[PDB]
Structure 1
Amino acid sequence: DGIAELTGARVEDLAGMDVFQGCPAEGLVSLAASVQPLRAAAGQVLLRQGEPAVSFLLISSGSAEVSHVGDDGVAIIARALPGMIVGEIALLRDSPRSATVTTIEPLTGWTGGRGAFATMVHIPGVGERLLRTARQRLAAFVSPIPVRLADGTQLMLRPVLPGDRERTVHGHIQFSGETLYRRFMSPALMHYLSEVDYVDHFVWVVTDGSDPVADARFVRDETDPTVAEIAFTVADAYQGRGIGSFLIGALSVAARVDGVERFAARMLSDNVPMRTIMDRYGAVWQREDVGVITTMIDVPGPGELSLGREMVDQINRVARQVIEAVG
């Protein structure tokens, strides 16, 4: 009859989504209180590149184009699908929206702020599922680059994907999810952000027959954003084939996209292959205690790397895809 009703999200609608099915009821009651219903026609702009990222979208039905336009006018375009989160990385990093999001067909879902996202990823089972969805979001448009070493070895170069162990297994640089991302804030949230972040921690992985044989990464300095520390690891049997030499090149291409101007490196003074790699870039060595040496080099500009132009363009394409387009 004349009874009062809720105006917000309904648990019944949220619970219909596969990601929440079976979750504790109280978790959904809290979430329902935190998000708002969204219904969009086709061809409608939901989010605009460069704007404040005040919300994320969770898509219940329909799909959208996600288009990042570079200052060079080059458009880098992904697709957001039902069950997918959109806009959440810029939301969590409090940075301008990375891409314009336009529906390709009628769309429905929910919107929410940073607190709603936190509430959502705290629900048991949900954070892990959403990370799998974030993985799928990347893997849908980012493909590995086949490369061949001078000895003929056939490998693939790809960014780490969300959930991959190479994200969290690094022994060379002192840093973690909580230390790197604390400035932006909750374990579940920090984990999620660390797994989906290509801006402050960028990791390349090299595989042989789908098995990782090497990785390299840079970690952005908290005090000077134009500087990152670098690290490399190549499986023993694969060493001395030029992979490390290749990776510092790949890492430089990604750093340029990420606005990293300079790399810091530390190692033992006797690590000959690693010193040699840095020597090629004009390293000036400073001595520290306990057999350690350090250096700082400029990230080589375009044309400066010994990699072919075609190789550089392929790596640049992927780096832009993972940094710029997809969150």
Structure 2
Amino acid sequence: TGARVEDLAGMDVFQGCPAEGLVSLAASVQPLRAAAGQVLLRQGEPAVSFLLISSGSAEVSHVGDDGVAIIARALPGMIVGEIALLRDSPRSATVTTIEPLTGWTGGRGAFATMVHIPGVGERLLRTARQRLAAFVSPIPVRLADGTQLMLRPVLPGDRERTVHGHIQFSGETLYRRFMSARVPSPALMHYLSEVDYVDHFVWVVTDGSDPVADARFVRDETDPTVAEIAFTVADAYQGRGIGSFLIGALSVAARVDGVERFAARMLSDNVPMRTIMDRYGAVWQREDVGVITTMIDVPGPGELSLGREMVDQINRVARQVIEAVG
């Protein structure tokens, strides 16, 4: 009954893989056909199953404890059902066919053989937590002047959210951040967007719909105990204390991630960033003309202006995203 290796060769998780690598698995799966409106999976059910989508589309619906449902979509080239099999846990979501759908599917054993394809298990994990991040609970954040926002992790869709959003990021902003006043290339947006949360962590703050700002760190290639950090705040939200908060938040996430030292780079002439830094120290060095750097140990307990309940919620959400699949 098995699948033609070509049949699986389009699936995102298999890209780069040598055809021979896929044969055992291609032998371990059966074809699946489903009509529009049909239910493939359900949120509490134990996981016996996984599916790879050749054609059609499916709605993903997750009911949080609040009782409100986050929705996403599963599309051709994508696995679904992998996560519960990854964590050995219940279905994270209910999955329903939108478009009539095909149709490669397998069981626990096929999954095993799949995981044993080199660098496949890793992709699966990455993408898994990537998806689980949508189900985490956005933390209410009320700044000193009363304006109310939300703290959550970046989602790939933030990319879209931001490009077509009504929130303005000035050329001067773009320049202070990326050193060009121009709007970020699609390639770049993808980079800022899709992350593993392990070597690349990103906070976004929103008005409750659209992201108004972000803070991220990327673990150093050679030294995993240090990461370079960066921030962006939308023009009209600047100067209200968002950046200070975000370095706190980022610091909690960092602590979780096993990161110790933050590295920073910036225009010598960008005062607020420098000020934020200066609160923790530390000495500035000149990296290049008009450009400065620095290195700080990560505060750390007692060194944060955030709160207790607050650092609790943050550390909780962060750790929830980071260790979700491991």
Q: Classify the TM-score, shorter chain.
A: 0.5 to 0.7
TM-score by length of 2: 0.58
More displaced stretch, 261-270 vs 116-125: 116-125
**Are residues 89 and 135 of structure 1, via their aligned partners in 2, closer, same or farther at CA, if it must alter by over 3 Å?**
closer
Q: Partner of 2:165: helix, strand, or coil?
A: coil
More displaced stretch, 194-203 vs 84-93: 84-93
**Are residues 177 and 125 of structure 1, via their aligned partners in 2, closer, same or farther at CA, if it must alter by over 3 Å?**
farther
Q: Partner of 1:76: helix, strand, or coil?
A: strand
Please, which of 24, 29, 41 is the counterpart of residue 30 of structure 1? 24
Q: Partner of 2:99: helix, strand, or coil?
A: coil
Mapped to 2, the partners of 1:325 and 1:94 lie a distance apart of 12
Cα RMSD between the aligned structures?
Answer: 10.8
**Are residues 22 and 174 of structure 1, via their aligned partners in 2, closer, same or farther at CA, if it must alter by over 3 Å?**
same
Q: Partner of 2:156: helix, strand, or coil?
A: coil
Q: Partner of 1:127: helix, strand, or coil?
A: helix
Q: Is contact 1:160-1:166 (8 Å) kept?
A: no
**Are residues 168 and 30 of structure 1, via their aligned partners in 2, closer, same or farther at CA, if it must alter by over 3 Å?**
farther
Whether 1:238 aligns to 2:260 is no
More displaced stretch, 203-212 vs 221-230: 203-212
Q: Is contact 1:256-1:299 (8 Å) kept?
A: yes
Offset, 1:141 = 3.2
TM-score by length of 1: 0.58
Q: Partner of 1:104: helix, strand, or coil?
A: strand
Q: What are the superposed Cα offsets for residues 129-179 of structure 1, whole Å, 9 maximum, x if unpaired? A: 999985884256301001000010100000002343189999999999999
Mapped to 2, the partners of 1:117 and 1:217 lie a distance apart of 34
Mapped to 2, the partners of 1:163 and 1:196 lie a distance apart of 12
Mapped to 1, the partners of 2:83 and 2:100 lie a distance apart of 24
The higher relative CO (CA closer than 8 Å, separation ≥ 6) is in 1
Q: What are the superposed Cα offsets for residues 27-53 of structure 1, whole Å, 9 maximum, x if unpaired? A: 999962476999999999999999999
**Are residues 17 and 240 of structure 1, via their aligned partners in 2, closer, same or farther at CA, if it must alter by over 3 Å?**
closer
Q: Is contact 1:263-1:299 (8 Å) kept?
A: yes
Q: Is contact 1:53-1:91 (8 Å) kept?
A: yes
Mapped to 2, the partners of 1:191 and 1:127 lie a distance apart of 22
Offset, 1:108 = 17
Q: Partner of 1:303: helix, strand, or coil?
A: coil
**Are residues 311 and 64 of structure 1, via their aligned partners in 2, closer, same or farther at CA, if it must alter by over 3 Å?**
farther
**Are residues 180 and 30 of structure 1, via their aligned partners in 2, closer, same or farther at CA, if it must alter by over 3 Å?**
farther
Mapped to 2, the partners of 1:285 and 1:172 lie a distance apart of 36
Please, which of 46, 56, 60 is the counterpart of residue 52 of structure 1? 46
More displaced stretch, 226-235 vs 181-190: 181-190
More displaced stretch, 304-313 vs 31-40: 31-40
Residue in 1 that maps onto 2:140:
146
Q: Is contact 1:59-1:85 (8 Å) kept?
A: yes
Q: Structure 1 runs of 4+ off > 3 angstroms?
A: 7-31, 33-137, 166-194
Q: Is contact 2:225-2:258 (8 Å) kept?
A: yes
Q: What are the superposed Cα offsets for residues 157-209 of structure 1, whole Å, 9 maximum, x if unpaired? A: 00002343189999999999999999999999998998351001101001014
Q: Is contact 2:220-2:226 (8 Å) kept?
A: yes
Identity %: 100
Mapped to 2, the partners of 1:136 and 1:225 lie a distance apart of 21
Q: Is contact 1:98-1:324 (8 Å) kept?
A: no
**Are residues 229 and 310 of structure 1, via their aligned partners in 2, closer, same or farther at CA, if it must alter by over 3 Å?**
same
**Are residues 262 and 107 of structure 1, via their aligned partners in 2, closer, same or farther at CA, if it must alter by over 3 Å?**
farther
Offset, 1:268 = 1.0
Offset, 1:303 = 2.0
More displaced stretch, 45-54 vs 262-271: 45-54
Q: Partner of 1:63: helix, strand, or coil?
A: strand
Unaligned runs of 5+ in 1: 1-6
Q: How many positions carry a matched residue from both structures? A: 321
Q: Is contact 2:204-2:215 (8 Å) kept?
A: yes
Q: Is contact 1:155-1:209 (8 Å) kept?
A: yes
Q: Is contact 2:158-2:211 (8 Å) kept?
A: no
More displaced stretch, 193-202 vs 22-31: 22-31
Whether 1:211 aligns to 2:205 is no
Q: Is contact 2:212-2:233 (8 Å) kept?
A: yes
Whether 1:176 aligns to 2:170 is yes
**Are residues 99 and 254 of structure 1, via their aligned partners in 2, closer, same or farther at CA, if it must alter by over 3 Å?**
farther
Offset, 1:122 = 18
More displaced stretch, 213-222 vs 80-89: 80-89
Mapped to 2, the partners of 1:22 and 1:262 lie a distance apart of 35
Q: Is contact 2:129-2:196 (8 Å) kept?
A: no
Whether 1:127 aligns to 2:152 is no
